[PDB]
């Protein structure tokens, strides 16, 4: 019977959750006692110095707080779903916001992969993984919580595969969904800290809604400038306003992989318009400011990035308005003489 | 003990995960395909040395930019794949992988990893193929590319089958023990 294939399918992925729940949890532990422990022991003392021993929060990041969340919260939550595995979509729903503390561990593992460059040498590192008889650098675990969080979705999207006529098919699609949210948002704020040249507060601009690279022109009112041969922008759009950057290229020593941005220019929210539709390309559309005194025509890389870019931009002047109106009616209120 | 860092990139669906388990299992999964494949430590026996091969997979981190580079960081090896039955991973070998690891890894070799051969002659396939006019990749094409490319070589196999498999793996093998040189223009 289908029904019955389908519970199957369903335990084998609840099992290997669960499987990688444990050893997930337990090589963090692994490390934490293994290597950030060590880096007090009095007994290793005289193979790390005091510099790198201060270092320790930046070599591990938050890994301790994350570790606690699975092994005392999540990890016990999971398994309080074996006998019915369509319903660790709620566990996952129910802890959304705990979620949050990997968006410290990314932002900080570029920062911890630096450091790891100068002293993965020293003799302290080569010693800790011999008793701990590893065969893979503390690197390799460091990375653990990233790799964790990248695979809660494709096991998520795996379960409600297999649970289309469940109960609790919702509530998967919604864990899903949200957890995709939390990769995006955190895959965008990568994006964000690596602004440079921004005279000011970025936190002042509200959240990030999206980021992304695009080919923009210029059709500018007559009265830098892409008027045929478009330039190369990475937009961040924010609550407040739409920030312009430019892609530094730009490594020199110890060659800083991931690219910076530079700060161009900002095109206030209150000003911008938008245009959905542009002649000869589904992928294209623009942002315009002043009633058009200034118009960018953004090539998407795909006509859903165009869509989504849309979408968000639109919640963005549908706020903007009902905010705008709620303040006019506070100050109509004012009819009282 | 040394160790060889063996990351494999490609577009999500190509068989990454699996092409792992099945190499390191010296079986393929019947009944349930594992999602995930977390790092793992390979002994083996570079003319009588004992080496670590460190492979690592990226299913699932696909789409974010950020946080996919942050496995690239002493990286001996990439095995940059794409299915021979998916025309658009192929294209994004070109078109997204490549660009992106030697940018991060100039002086990191890579290998063009074409998989699914299984698949390439099989009637279904070729057939919802046509229904978009697209044709599998051929050996020739991906030579082709590979040469283009700047990738040490191009290696093909079948998780499925495990025809070539073994050989893919050695081939990061040998690639990883070259001395430190940027890509340079392959004959054939």
Same mark, same amino acid.
């Given at each position: 019977?289908?029904?019955? /294939?389908?519970?199957?399918?369903?335990?084998?992925?609840?099992?290997?959750?669960?499987?990688?729940?444990?050893?997930?949890?337990?090589?963090?532990?692994?490390?934490?006692?293994?290597?950030?422990?060590?880096?007090?022991?009095?007994?290793?003392?005289?193979?790390?110095?005091?510099?790198?021993?201060?270092?320790?929060?930046?070599?591990?990041?938050?890994?301790?707080?994350?570790?606690?969340?699975?092994?005392?919260?999540?990890?016990?939550?999971?398994?309080?779903?074996?006998?019915?595995?369509?319903?660790?979509?709620?566990?996952?729903?129910?802890?959304?916001?705990?979620?949050?503390?990997?968006?410290?561990?990314?932002?900080?593992?570029?920062?911890?992969?630096?450091?790891?460059?100068?002293?993965?040498?020293?003799?302290?590192?080569?010693?800790?993984?011999?008793?701990?008889?590893?065969?893979?650098?503390?690197?390799?675990?460091?990375?653990?919580?990233?790799?964790?969080?990248?695979?809660?979705?494709?096991?998520?999207?795996?379960?409600?595969?297999?649970?289309?006529?469940?109960?609790?098919?919702?509530?998967?699609?919604?864990?899903?969904?949200?957890?995709?949210?939390?990769?995006?948002?955190?895959?965008?704020?990568?994006?964000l800290?690596?602004i440079?040249?921004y005279?000011g507060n970025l936190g002042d601009l509200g959240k990030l809604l999206m980021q992304?690279?695009?080919?923009?022109?210029?059709?500018?009112?007559?009265?830098?400038?892409?008027?045929?041969?478009?330039?190369?922008?990475?937009l961040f759009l924010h609550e407040k306003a739409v920030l312009?950057?430019?892609?530094?290229?730009?490594?020199?020593?110890?060659?800083?992989?991931?690219?910076?941005? /530079?700060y161009?220019?900002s095109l206030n929210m209150t000003?911008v318009?938008?245009?959905?539709?542009?002649?000869?390309?589904?992928?294209?559309?623009?942002?315009?400011?002043?009633?058009?005194?200034?118009?960018?025509?953004?090539?998407?890389?795909?006509?859903?990035?165009?869509?989504?870019?849309?979408?968000?931009?639109?919640?963005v002047?549908?706020?903007?308005?009902?905010?705008?109106?709620?303040?006019?009616?506070?100050?109509?209120?004012?009819? /009282?003489? | 003990?040394?160790?060889?860092?063996?990351?494999?990139?490609?577009?999500?669906?190509?068989? !990454?995960?699996?092409?792992?388990?099945?190499?390191?299992?010296? !079986?393929?999964?019947?009944?349930?395909?594992?999602?995930?494949?977390?790092?793992?430590?390979?002994?083996?026996?570079?003319?009588?040395?004992?080496?670590?091969?460190?492979?690592?997979?990226?299913?699932?981190?696909?789409?974010?930019?950020?946080?996919?580079?942050?496995?690239?960081?002493?990286?001996?090896?990439?095995?940059?794949?794409?299915?021979?039955?998916?025309?658009?991973?192929?294209?994004?070998?070109?078109? %997204?992988?490549?660009?992106?690891?030697?940018?991060?890894?100039?002086?990191?070799?890579?290998?063009?990893?074409?998989?699914?051969?299984?698949?390439?002659?099989?009637?279904?396939?070729?057939?919802?193929?046509?229904?978009?006019?697209?044709?599998?990749?051929?050996?020739?094409?991906?030579? %082709?590319?590979?040469?283009?490319? !700047?990738?040490? %070589?191009?290696?093909?196999?079948?998780?499925?089958?495990?025809?070539?498999?073994?050989?893919?793996?050695?081939?990061?093998?040998?690639?990883?023990?070259?001395?430190?040189?940027? !890509?340079?223009?392959?004959?054939?």
């Open positions: 019977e289908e029904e019955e /294939s389908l519970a199957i399918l369903r335990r084998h992925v609840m099992n290997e959750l669960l499987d990688t729940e444990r050893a997930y949890v337990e090589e963090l532990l692994c490390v934490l006692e293994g290597y950030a422990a060590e880096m007090d022991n009095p007994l290793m003392a005289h193979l790390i110095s005091t510099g790198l021993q201060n270092k320790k929060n930046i070599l591990f990041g938050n890994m301790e707080e994350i570790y606690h969340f699975h092994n005392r919260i999540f990890l016990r939550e999971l398994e309080s779903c074996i006998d019915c595995p369509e319903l660790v979509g709620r566990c996952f729903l129910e802890r959304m916001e705990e979620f949050q503390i990997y968006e410290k561990y990314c932002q900080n593992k570029p920062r911890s992969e630096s450091l790891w460059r100068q002293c993965s040498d020293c003799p302290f590192f080569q010693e800790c993984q011999k008793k701990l008889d590893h065969k893979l650098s503390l690197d390799s675990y460091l990375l653990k919580p990233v790799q964790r969080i990248t695979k809660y979705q494709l096991l998520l999207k795996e379960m409600l595969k297999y649970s289309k006529h469940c109960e609790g098919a919702e509530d998967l699609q919604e864990a899903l969904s949200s957890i995709l949210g939390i990769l995006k948002a955190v895959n965008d704020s990568m994006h800290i690596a440079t040249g005279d992304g690279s695009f080919s923009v022109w210029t059709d500018h009112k007559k009265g830098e400038l892409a008027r045929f041969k478009p330039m190369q922008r990475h312009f950057c430019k892609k530094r290229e730009e490594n020199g020593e110890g060659y800083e992989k991931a690219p910076s941005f /530079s161009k220019q000003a318009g938008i245009t959905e539709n542009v002649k000869g390309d589904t992928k294209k559309f623009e942002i315009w400011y002043n009633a058009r005194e200034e118009v960018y025509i953004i090539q998407a890389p795909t006509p859903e990035i165009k869509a989504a870019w849309v979408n968000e931009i639109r919640k002047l549908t706020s903007q308005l009902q905010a705008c109106r709620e303040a006019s009616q506070h100050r109509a209120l004012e009819q /009282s003489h | 003990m040394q160790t060889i860092k063996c990351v494999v990139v490609g577009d999500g669906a190509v068989g !990454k995960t699996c092409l792992l388990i099945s190499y390191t299992t010296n !079986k393929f999964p019947s009944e349930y395909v594992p999602t995930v494949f977390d790092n793992y430590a390979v002994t083996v026996m570079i003319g009588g040395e004992p080496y670590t091969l460190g492979l690592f997979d990226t299913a699932g981190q696909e789409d974010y930019d950020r946080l996919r580079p942050l496995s690239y960081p002493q990286t001996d090896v990439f095995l940059v794949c794409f299915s021979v039955v998916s025309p658009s991973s192929f294209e994004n070998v070109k078109e %997204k992988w490549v660009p992106e690891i030697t940018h991060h890894c100039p002086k990191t070799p890579f290998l063009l990893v074409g998989t699914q051969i299984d698949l390439r002659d099989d009637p279904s396939t070729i057939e919802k193929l046509a229904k978009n006019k697209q044709k599998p990749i051929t050996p020739e094409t991906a030579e %082709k590319l590979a040469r283009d490319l !700047k990738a040490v %070589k191009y290696v093909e196999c079948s998780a499925l089958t495990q025809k070539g498999l073994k050989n893919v793996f050695d081939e990061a093998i040998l690639a990883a023990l070259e001395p430190p040189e940027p !890509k340079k223009s392959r004959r054939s």
